[PDB]
């Protein structure tokens, strides 16, 4: 199931198994770590619309006397 | 959303208050720059 | 106006990364609070 | 055959400080520089030795008891300071001590006085030396 | 109406002295004939910094940018964060802020971010060991510039946190009619993202010039690395001549650019300090504008500061001229009775200024 | 647990042992030991 | 040519003032002579021994 | 193409692939090509300087006392009048060629000069020493400018960039470190070859570089990528020497088992 897909993704990118096997750069591993993390968390397989409320909240967080009256063009 | 912001603000104001009270009751009864040495190494 | 009770949290991303970080550190150390046979 | 040799050298058959603050100060009084190196004697738990490790590029420790070196290895196991740290096992009077710029040591009082004279007569001696030691002597 | 002045010359001084007076000012004809007329980004950013720590001020930049109308508010302060543009370092903004910090409603706890050093601006150490000590002499007991991270040019990335816990009504009356004796010379040789030998070689250049002196020479060998070493490699040295008798200091600073030999720069800043000492009587030229203003804003009493002939240049004259229009205060000079040197005693009176913004 | 001690001595690499006679040896029991010619050639 | 008066005659420019009796603060580092001239000038530590103990 | 070995120099025309001439010599350590290309230098392990002519078909004059110990590494200025030698005796010897070769000056050094590398602009000179630090001298001033640090082991090869702003260094520690001139600063360190990298070569007018190592591998990297374009495994035994054409087209690599192969871009 999700485990089988996941263990396959790690192995394809070289994240699992022996490294001294006899008979990919590290920086690309971290990019693989980033890519796998987002893919396999369907809550953030894909969820239905509306299960998450992140877009509502992020808009909210984005939402003194005398003034520097700047009339420069 | 404003409810959470108010709770955080009141916690900050109260926490700062107790620290201020603690300083006075402590007061009533050298080198400022050590930390640079640690941050210098990284 | 004042609010009587604690607001129900919002699971933003930054909460999500923080939670999963702690899960990974627990398993990295194998620090598992699970029942064992006695 | 390794363990039998370890038995052959040493049969495998001490007082410990409770106050780290004084031991912390002894590092502060030493005033080792990062460009400088340290040799350590009688590490034991070696909380003193760790404070040397953070400050000194290279730390060479010699422990009399093989077991005390092991618990040191366990405590410093899996730390960056471990690789810089060098642990020496057994009596260092016989061995020619490697050069060290400063001395910090929790030397036993029984063997102390020969060690100072060796330290004094060690070619190219340290500029500073600190040793944990008895009062009367 | 508004006291009307010309050009970008002494721009900050005319804003801060306006702030200290409470007298509104107009400065016009800012680079009128230049291809890029009007205010530049950094000095626009500075006006924002003034607005952050002052309260009730009115600032009007013109349509072409060549005129500013400044109506000062009361100095209030508080905790804030300022983004220094890459054109100038943090040092450009901290020094004029030191003019205002002790005289506020609330303590100044301001984080400055950007480049931290340049060839023309004050370094951290110049503020730290070179201008801040003068404030200890003026009665500012508690004041600190905490260095969190350096940013060398051109990319910067540094952070410095300014704290002035001492709030005082006015600076103490100055009385220094003697040429202070220097007891020792200290300093800091600094580098970022580069091998420690550069700092040591920098100190090597410095000791070579100064070993002829009969003094103790102790220059700190200090090397940044890691996350906090900025985003560009760079290095500079600051050498300070220190007088433990009456707590006086003289300092010279410069940074090394591409292709320069660290020994060569260490030699520069070393002979540079010595040149400063020969031209100094009680304070250096880089400290004289700092010292005079606090006396002009002292209590209604005559204070005496000794200055060398080399200090009274065009810089001393225009600076004095700027003070008069804002405060109407005139600095008188009388010769010293000595014949060994031709120094002068600058006698100034404070205007009776008081920190009325403070809660009592 | 002496057997758990000796292996820990052997597992780590930065250890040198001191016998009675006068030289330095490793845990395994063998005498623990750049050149311009070698590094390039 | 007492400089005390010359400072307060605004019609005289500061540069013109300096020469008879004998540039911008945004440059905090003050004016100095060239290296080699300073190096020859300070080959010795004379003229300053009074300032140091 | 010139190929220098013990007891002999062999020059091969690439089109013919046949040896034009063979010159007897000693255990020649480094082989450099005089200005104009009529002539070739060798540096012997005996230390005697070697001077060849393509035209005369033999060595001109062997300066037996030119050097005390082995001239391990030798290089040539862009104009080519000034010749510098890096060697065991820990003294760098400068020579000037005239219509005879004369030694102008000797530079004392604390440690032996394993590799000497001259900039094409000839304004600085990197010195490779056993003490694991590479000191760079200005050639026009003759004074010390910066010292490379952080090599676990001595640097085997030094390269100079076309802009000359980048100093490429490959070390017995098997990590290739690239140094910013502008402040002597690392952009990146790369453990490219599982064995040490004897010679690395810089692509002409390109921040790329080639490497050769005892593991018999040759790798093609780009600076702005800091990543290896291509890896080449054609050497049965360890590759000693690597070279790059003045054209840049074809890249000569020589194995320990006497195999000479040259790599061409498509």
From Swiss-Prot, chain A:
Region Disordered: start-end pairs: 1-29
Subcellular location: Nucleus, Nucleolus
Biased composition, class Basic and acidic residues, residue ranges: 24-29
SUBUNIT field: Interacts with snoRNA U3. Interacts with EMG1, MPP10 and NOC4. Component of the ribosomal small subunit (SSU) processome composed of at least 40 protein subunits and snoRNA U3.
Family statement drawn from the similarity comment of this UniProt entry: Belongs to the NOP14 family.
Function: Involved in nucleolar processing of pre-18S ribosomal RNA. Has a role in the nuclear export of 40S pre-ribosomal subunit to the cytoplasm.
Protein name: Nucleolar complex protein 14
Curated annotation (Swiss-Prot), chain D:
GO cellular component, as recorded: 90S preribosome; cytoplasm; nucleolus; preribosome, small subunit precursor
Keywords in alphabetical order: Cytoplasm, Methyltransferase, Nucleus, Ribosome biogenesis, RNA-binding, rRNA processing, S-adenosyl-L-methionine, Transferase
GO biological process per UniProt: maturation of SSU-rRNA from tricistronic rRNA transcript (SSU-rRNA, 5.8S rRNA, LSU-rRNA); rRNA methylation; rRNA modification
Location of the protein in the cell: Cytoplasm; Nucleus, Nucleolus
GO molecular function, one term: rRNA (adenine-N6,N6-)-dimethyltransferase activity
Residues that hold S-adenosyl-L-methionine according to the record: 15, 17, 42, 63, 91, 106
Protein family membership: Belongs to the class I-like SAM-binding methyltransferase superfamily. rRNA adenine N(6)-methyltransferase family.
Function text: Specifically dimethylates two adjacent adenosines in the loop of a conserved hairpin near the 3'-end of 18S rRNA in the 40S particle.
Protein name per the record: Dimethyladenosine transferase
Organism of derivation: Saccharomyces cerevisiae (strain ATCC 204508 / S288c)
Portion of the full-length sequence here: 19 to 159 of 318
Swiss-Prot record, chain F:
Main function: Involved in nucleolar processing of pre-18S ribosomal RNA. Required for the early cleavages at sites A0, A1 and A2 during 18S ribosomal pre-RNA processing.
Whole-protein coverage range: 549 to 593 of 593
Family: Belongs to the MPP10 family.
Protein name: U3 small nucleolar RNA-associated protein MPP10
Subcellular location(s) of the protein: Nucleus, Nucleolus
Assembly behavior: Component of a heterotrimeric complex containing IMP3, IMP4 and MPP10. Interacts with snoRNA U3. Component of the ribosomal small subunit (SSU) processome composed of at least 40 protein subunits and snoRNA U3. Interacts with the SSU processome subunits EMG1, IMP3, IMP4, KRR1, NOC4/UTP19, NOP1, RPS4A, RPS4B, RPS6A, RPS6B, RPS7A, RPS7B, RPS9A, RPS9B, RPS14A, RPS14B, UTP1-UTP18, UTP20-UTP22 and UTP25.
Region named Disordered: 16-41
Swiss-Prot record, chain H:
Domain of life: Eukaryota
Repeat (WD) residue spans along the chain: 23-53, 66-96, 150-180, 192-222, 234-264
Localisation: Nucleus, Nucleolus
Family: Belongs to the WD repeat WDR3/UTP12 family.
SUBUNIT field: Interacts with snoRNA U3. Interacts with MPP10. Component of the ribosomal small subunit (SSU) processome composed of at least 40 protein subunits and snoRNA U3.
Function recorded in the entry: Involved in nucleolar processing of pre-18S ribosomal RNA.
Further remarks about this protein from its record: Present with 9620 molecules/cell in log phase SD medium.
Protein name (database record): U3 small nucleolar RNA-associated protein 12
Organism: Saccharomyces cerevisiae (strain ATCC 204508 / S288c)
Gene name of the encoded protein: DIP2
Residues of the full protein shown: 406 to 687 of 943
């Amino acid at each position: 199931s999700q485990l089988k897909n996941l263990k396959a993704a790690l192995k394809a990118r070289g994240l699992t198994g022996q490294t001294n096997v006899k008979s990919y750069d590290r920086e690309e591993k971290k990019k693989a770590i980033a890519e796998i993390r987002e893919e396999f968390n369907p809550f953030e397989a894909v969820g239905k619309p509306g299960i998450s409320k992140q877009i509502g909240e992020e808009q909210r967080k984005r939402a003194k006397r005398g003034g520097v009256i700047d009339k420069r063009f | 959303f404003e409810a959470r912001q108010r709770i955080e603000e009141k916690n900050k104001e109260s926490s700062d208050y107790h620290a201020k009270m603690a300083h006075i009751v402590n007061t009533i009864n050298k080198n400022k720059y050590e930390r640079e040495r640690k941050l210098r190494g990284g | 106006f004042d609010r009587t009770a604690k607001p129900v949290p919002v699971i933003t991303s930054e909460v999500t990364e923080s939670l999963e970080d702690m899960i990974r550190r627990r398993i990295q150390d194998s620090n598992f609070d699970d029942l064992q046979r006695r | 055959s390794a363990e039998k040799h370890l038995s052959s050298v040493f049969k495998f058959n001490q007082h410990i400080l409770k106050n780290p603050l004084v031991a912390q100060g002894i590092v502060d009084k030493a005033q080792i520089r990062p460009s400088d190196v340290v040799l350590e004697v009688g590490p034991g738990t070696g909380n003193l030795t760790v404070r040397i490790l953070e400050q000194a590029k290279n730390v060479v420790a010699v422990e009399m008891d093989p077991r005390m070196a092991a618990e040191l290895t366990k405590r410093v196991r899996g730390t960056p300071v471990e690789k810089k740290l060098e642990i020496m096992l057994g009596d260092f009077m016989k061995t020619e001590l490697p050069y060290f710029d400063i001395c910090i040591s929790n030397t036993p009082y029984q063997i102390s006085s020969p060690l100072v004279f060796k330290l004094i007569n060690q070619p190219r001696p340290p500029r500073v030396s600190i040793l944990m030691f008895q009062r009367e002597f | 109406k508004y006291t009307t002045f010309q050009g970008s010359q002494n721009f900050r001084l005319r804003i801060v002295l306006a702030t200290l007076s409470g007298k509104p000012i107009k400065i016009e004809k800012i680079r009128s004939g230049d291809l890029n007329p009007g205010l530049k980004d950094y000095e626009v950013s500075f006006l924002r910094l003034i607005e952050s720590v002052t309260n009730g001020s009115v600032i009007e930049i013109s349509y072409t940018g060549t005129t500013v109308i400044y109506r000062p508010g009361i100095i209030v302060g508080g905790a804030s964060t300022h983004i220094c543009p890459s054109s100038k370092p943090v040092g450009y903004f901290v020094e004029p802020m030191l003019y205002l910090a002790p005289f506020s409603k609330k303590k100044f706890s301001i984080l400055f971010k950007g480049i931290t050093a340049s060839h023309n601006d004050a370094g951290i150490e110049a503020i730290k060991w070179g201008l801040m000590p003068v404030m200890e002499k003026f009665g500012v007991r508690e004041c600190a510039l905490h260095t969190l991270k350096r940013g060398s040019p051109p990319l910067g990335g540094g952070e410095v946190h300014l704290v002035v816990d001492s709030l005082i009504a006015q600076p103490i009356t100055m009385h220094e009619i003697d040429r202070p004796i220097i007891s020792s010379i200290t300093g800091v040789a600094y580098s970022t993202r580069v091998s420690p030998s550069l700092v040591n070689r920098m100190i090597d250049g410095a000791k070579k010039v100064l070993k002829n002196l009969q003094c103790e020479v102790n220059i700190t060998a200090d090397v940044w690395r890691g996350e906090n070493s900025g985003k560009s490699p760079g290095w500079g040295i600051t050498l300070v001549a220190q007088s433990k008798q009456k707590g006086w200091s003289y300092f010279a600073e410069d940074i090394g650019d591409a292709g320069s030999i660290p020994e060569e720069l260490g030699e520069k800043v070393a002979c540079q300090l010595l040149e400063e000492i020969s031209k100094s009587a009680a304070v250096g030229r880089n400290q004289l504008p700092l010292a005079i203003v606090y006396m002009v804003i002292g209590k209604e009493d005559i204070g005496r500061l000794r200055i060398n002939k080399e200090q009274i240049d065009e810089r001393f004259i225009i600076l004095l001229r700027d003070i008069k229009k804002i405060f109407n205060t005139e600095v008188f000079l009388k010769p010293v009775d000595e014949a060994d040197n031709e120094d002068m005693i600058a006698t100034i009176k404070g205007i009776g200024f008081t920190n009325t913004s403070k809660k009592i | 647990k002496r057997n758990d001690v000796v292996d820990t001595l052997s597992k780590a690499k930065n250890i040198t042992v001191i016998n009675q006679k006068g030289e330095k040896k490793d845990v395994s029991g063998k005498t623990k030991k750049p050149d311009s010619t070698n590094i390039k050639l | 040519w007492n400089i005390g008066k010359l400072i307060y005659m605004d019609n005289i420019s500061p540069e013109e003032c300096i020469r008879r009796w004998r540039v911008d603060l945004e440059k905090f580092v003050p004016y100095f002579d060239t290296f080699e001239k300073l190096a020859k000038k300070w080959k010795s530590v004379d003229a300053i021994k009074e300032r140091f103990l | 193409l010139a190929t220098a070995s013990n007891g002999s120099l062999k020059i091969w025309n690439i089109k013919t692939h046949k040896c034009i001439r063979t010159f007897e010599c000693g255990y020649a350590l480094t082989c450099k090509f005089l200005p104009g290309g009529l002539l070739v230098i060798l540096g012997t392990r005996n230390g005697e300087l070697q001077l060849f002519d393509l035209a005369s078909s033999s060595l001109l004059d062997t300066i037996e006392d030119a050097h005390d110990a082995a001239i391990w590494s030798l290089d040539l200025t862009s104009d080519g009048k000034r010749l510098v030698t890096g060697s065991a005796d820990k003294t760098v010897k400068f020579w000037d060629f005239k219509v005879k070769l004369h030694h102008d000056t000797t530079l004392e050094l604390t440690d032996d000069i394993l590799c000497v590398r001259v900039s094409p602009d000839d304004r600085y000179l990197a010195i490779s020493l056993l003490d694991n630090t590479v000191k760079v001298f200005f050639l026009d001033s003759m004074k010390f400018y910066l010292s490379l640090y952080g090599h676990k082991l001595p640097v085997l090869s030094i390269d100079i960039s076309f802009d000359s702003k980048m100093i490429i260094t490959s070390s017995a520690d098997k990590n290739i470190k690239i140094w910013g001139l502008d402040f002597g600063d690392c952009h990146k360190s790369l453990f490219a070859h599982q064995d040490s990298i004897m010679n690395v070569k810089f692509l002409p007018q390109s921040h790329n570089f080639f490497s050769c190592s005892k593991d018999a591998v040759v790798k093609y990297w780009d600076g702005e990528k800091f990543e290896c374009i291509q890896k080449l495994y054609a050497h049965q035994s360890e590759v000693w020497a690597l070279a790059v054409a003045t054209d840049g087209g074809f890249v000569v690599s020589s194995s320990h088992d006497h195999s000479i192969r040259i790599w061409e871009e498509t």
